[PDB]
Amino acid sequence: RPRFSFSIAAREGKARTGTIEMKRGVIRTPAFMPVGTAATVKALKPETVRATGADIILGNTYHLMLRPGAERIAKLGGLHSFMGWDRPILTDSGGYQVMSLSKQSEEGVTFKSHGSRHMLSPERSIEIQHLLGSDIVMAFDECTPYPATPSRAASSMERSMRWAKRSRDAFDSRKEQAENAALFGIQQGSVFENLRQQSADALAEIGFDGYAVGGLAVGEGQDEMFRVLDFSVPMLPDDKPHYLMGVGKPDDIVGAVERGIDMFDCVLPTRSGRNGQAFTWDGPINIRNARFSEDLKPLDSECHCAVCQKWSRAYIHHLIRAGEILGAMLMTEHNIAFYQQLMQKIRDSISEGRFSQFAQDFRARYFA
Amino acid sequence: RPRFSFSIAAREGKARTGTIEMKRGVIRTPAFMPVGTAATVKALKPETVRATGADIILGNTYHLMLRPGAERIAKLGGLHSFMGWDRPILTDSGGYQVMSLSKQSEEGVTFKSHGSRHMLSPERSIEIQHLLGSDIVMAFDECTPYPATPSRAASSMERSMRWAKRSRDAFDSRKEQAENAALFGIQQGSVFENLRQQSADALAEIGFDGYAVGGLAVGEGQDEMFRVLDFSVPMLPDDKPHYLMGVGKPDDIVGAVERGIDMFDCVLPTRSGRNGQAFTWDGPINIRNARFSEDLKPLDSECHCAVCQKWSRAYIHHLIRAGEILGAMLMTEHNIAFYQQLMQKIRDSISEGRFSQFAQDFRARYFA
Numbered sequence: 001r002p003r004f005s006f007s008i009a010a011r012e013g014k015a016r017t018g019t020i021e022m023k024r025g026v027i028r029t030p031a032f033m034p035v036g037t038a039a040t041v042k043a044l045k046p047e048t049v050r051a052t053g054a055d056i057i058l059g060n061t062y063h064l065m066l067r068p069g070a071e072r073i074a075k076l077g078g079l080h081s082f083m084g085w086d087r088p089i090l091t092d093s094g095g096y097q098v099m100s101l102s103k104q105s106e107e108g109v110t111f112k113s114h115g116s117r118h119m120l121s122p123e124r125s126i127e128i129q130h131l132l133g134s135d136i137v138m139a140f141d142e143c144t145p146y147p148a149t150p151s152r153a154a155s156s157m158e159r160s161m162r163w164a165k166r167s168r169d170a171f172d173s174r175k176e177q178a179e180n181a182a183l184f185g186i187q188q189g190s191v192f193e194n195l196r197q198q199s200a201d202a203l204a205e206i207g208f209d210g211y212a213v214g215g216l217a218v219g220e221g222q223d224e225m226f227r228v229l230d231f232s233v234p235m236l237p238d239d240k241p242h243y244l245m246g247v248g249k250p251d252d253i254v255g256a257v258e259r260g261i262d263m264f265d266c267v268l269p270t271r272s273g274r275n276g277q278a279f280t281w282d283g284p285i286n287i288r289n290a291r292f293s294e295d296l297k298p299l300d301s302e303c304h305c306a307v308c309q310k311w312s313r314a315y316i317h318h319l320i321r322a323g324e325i326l327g328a329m330l331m332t333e334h335n336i337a338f339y340q341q342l343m344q345k346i347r348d349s350i351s352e353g354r355f356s357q358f359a360q361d362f363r364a365r366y367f368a
Numbered sequence: 369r370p371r372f373s374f375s376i377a378a379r380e381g382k383a384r385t386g387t388i389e390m391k392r393g394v395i396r397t398p399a400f401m402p403v404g405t406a407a408t409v410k411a412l413k414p415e416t417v418r419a420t421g422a423d424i425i426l427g428n429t430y431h432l433m434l435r436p437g438a439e440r441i442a443k444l445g446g447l448h449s450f451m452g453w454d455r456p457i458l459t460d461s462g463g464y465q466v467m468s469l470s471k472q473s474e475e476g477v478t479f480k481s482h483g484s485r486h487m488l489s490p491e492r493s494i495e496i497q498h499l500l501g502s503d504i505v506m507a508f509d510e511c512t513p514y515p516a517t518p519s520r521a522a523s524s525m526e527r528s529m530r531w532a533k534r535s536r537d538a539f540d541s542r543k544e545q546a547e548n549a550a551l552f553g554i555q556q557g558s559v560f561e562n563l564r565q566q567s568a569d570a571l572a573e574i575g576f577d578g579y580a581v582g583g584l585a586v587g588e589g590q591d592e593m594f595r596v597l598d599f600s601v602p603m604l605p606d607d608k609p610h611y612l613m614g615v616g617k618p619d620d621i622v623g624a625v626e627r628g629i630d631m632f633d634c635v636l637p638t639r640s641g642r643n644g645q646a647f648t649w650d651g652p653i654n655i656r657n658a659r660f661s662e663d664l665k666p667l668d669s670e671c672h673c674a675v676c677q678k679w680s681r682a683y684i685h686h687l688i689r690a691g692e693i694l695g696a697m698l699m700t701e702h703n704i705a706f707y708q709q710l711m712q713k714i715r716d717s718i719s720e721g722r723f724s725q726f727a728q729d730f731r732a733r734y735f736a
């Protein structure tokens with residue numbers, strides 16, 4: 001089993017499909033990572049996450065360093081053993097959650113807990129991810145809020161590229177990490193094509209196993225996100241995976257794949273599932289709506305998940321309206337399974353040379 | 369498959385062990401019924417409930433008639449189909465929850481929802497339980513609060529015995545119910561031996577498939593409950609099952625079996641599981657306690673449940689402290705499995721003629 005081996009098996013336009021082989025398993029691309037921020041994918045056992053088709057999940061440096069603590073997780077055997085997920089885990093490096101939930105300098109950032117005071121830096125972020133035992137480690141960078149000025153973007157991007165170098169060196173200075181895990185760099189530059197190019201060149205100069213597109217899914221709109229992707233993804237090394245952080249709605253994922261993205265993560269299927277939103281091929285539905293009170297059909301008429309094989313909309317309606325935990329469990333399992341079936345349909349259509357048609361057919365029905 | 373067939377396979381003192389055969393399955397006695405008040409055993413899929421060893425679960429007439437409604441559940445195919453549990457279901461008849469959560473007469477009771485106004489009577493309670501499709505139907509009675517006067521007890525008991533007759537006739541007047549389901553009567557009389565005898569005679573005069581001991585688990589203390597059981601259970605027909613409603617803690621169950629009880633129900637393993645209390649053979653523990661933050665052992669060192677095979681105390685500690693749904697799921701599955709292993713140990717020890725020794729050994733270690 002290799003440390004990190006990305007193969008592209010088929011292409012169509014800018015879209016690609018293939019695999020990433022790692023020590024703890026194979027990751028089919030394009031891939032969706034369920035989010036497991038507090039060492040759990042909310043309301044699901046790891047076996048259920050795997051059953052839906054997930055190959056890899058996402059954990060969070062910022063959250064786990066606060067609770068229950070990275071030194072503690074290391075002492076208890078690592079994140080995989082701690083939560084019972086034995087497949088690959090990607091860990092965000094803490095930059096986006098420091099800005100979103102929690103005194104910056106060139107050395108790093110000090111911040112207050114969501115409330116004690118804590119510190120993060122490129123070297124400290126990489127060491128926490130070693131302690132957690134992450135398989136895909138993210139370089140630590142400095143995010144700037146949206147809609148950032150053109151100067152707030154260039155300053156955050158330039159620093160992030162210097163921090164990308166220190167992340168590389170810290171990772172490479174840890175033998176167990178460099179031999180068993182992989183390191184991704186994060187392209188910044190906001191919506192500015194020249195800054196995105198400068199970021200891409202700096203990251204390719206350093207050299208990473210994969211490249212993320214940062215600074216999107218921040219309230220910019222899909223048209224702007226698609227516009228930024230149009231020129232930004234072709235700047236990244238073609239032969240490495242492309243990871244769009246924080247995205248997104250089903251139609252966002254399809255358009256992003258059409259533009260060359262290989263990996264995705266978003267809290268939407270879990271979070272909105274608990275809120276009562278179920279994804280279907282005819283678009284989302286709110287299972288709390290009174291129209292579902294006596295609807296015996298499954299959540300989606302085609303879905304293969306265990307929820308749609310056993311329980312009705314009317315039952316899940318009742319559960320969510322009564323605030324029952326089982327309602328959150330069933331809604332979440334269905335939504336994560338819907339996302340995985342979507343990625344499977346994308347992978348199959350690219351490999352068969354009919355992804356353009358699939359995308360057109362998908363949007364025609366989903367937005368009907 | 370018979371409608372209702374209770375066999376006693378072995379005895380020891382007053383304790384008995386055996387089976388109840390019903391159309392939807394076999395119920396091993398002494399039995400513990402997990403409580404599924406809102407058409408769900410809280411935080412568990414029915415398959416997980418069955419995995420822990422449960423043969424039968426309990427539903428609630430008062431709750432289901434309010435939400436989502438009994439006529440509705442009937443229209444959607446019945447309670448079994450609605451929630452996905454295809455084995456026996458016992459339904460409490462609504463008397464205790466009317467008094468506890470929600471204008472009485474000889475005809476019945478009118479009350480306000482937990483908030484519209486609603487009505488219950490012996491005939492209306494039996495019809496709701498038919499609509500739900502319950503396998504074991506409970507007679508509708510009139511509970512009086514604890515610590516009831518000697519006059520509040522005799523008046524509630526006498527009315528309950530008249531209501532037990534109307535429940536019998538309403539059940540018997542419904543052909544599908546009388547042929548496929550069973551009917552239990554509820555002994556009342558508070559702590560008064562003469563009233564308990566009058567209740568027992570009236571119920572045996574009518575004739576039921578089983579007999580419950582009502583009016584306990586109301587804040588009377590275990591010594592008083594055991595005292596009431598000492599004379600009350602021998603008043604019931606020996607050849608029918610004896611059901612102690614609302615009980616209870618592990619040591620309550622053992623002492624109750626020693627006194628002739630065959631069936632049990634309590635929210636304690638589910639409710640206190642969500643609150644962080646885990647049952648072990650060395651007594652309960654609060655998994656939130658800081659002493660468990662780095663404890664890699666399972667919840668209980670002997671437990672056979674899937675939770676104790678996979679996850680540590682330290683992980684479940686973290687989950688419950690973060691308010692994670694998975695914490696409630698794992699705590700609940702372990703507690704219900706612990707209860708079922710307790711009943712299995714009771715059944716095995718009675719059948720082997722060593723239940724007295726088991727009870728002594730159990731209490732010595734549980735209260736150490």
Ligand SMILES: CNc1nc2cc(C(=O)NN)ccc2[nH]1
Nearest residue numbers: 095096186214215216217245246
């Ligand atoms: C949900 N939106 C969203 N945007 C993100 C951006 C980043 C980023 O630029 N990290 N360096 C990370 C996670 C994100 N999640």
Ligand SMILES: CNc1nc2cc(C(=O)NN)ccc2[nH]1
Nearest residue numbers: 463464554582583584585613614
């Ligand atoms: C938890 N305690 C508890 N006591 C109960 C008494 C009755 C009763 O007398 N019904 N007729 C029913 C359920 C109970 N649950």
Ligand SMILES: [Zn+2]
Nearest residue numbers: 303305308334
């Ligand atoms: Zn589904």
Ligand SMILES: [Zn+2]
Nearest residue numbers: 671673676702
């Ligand atoms: Zn266990």
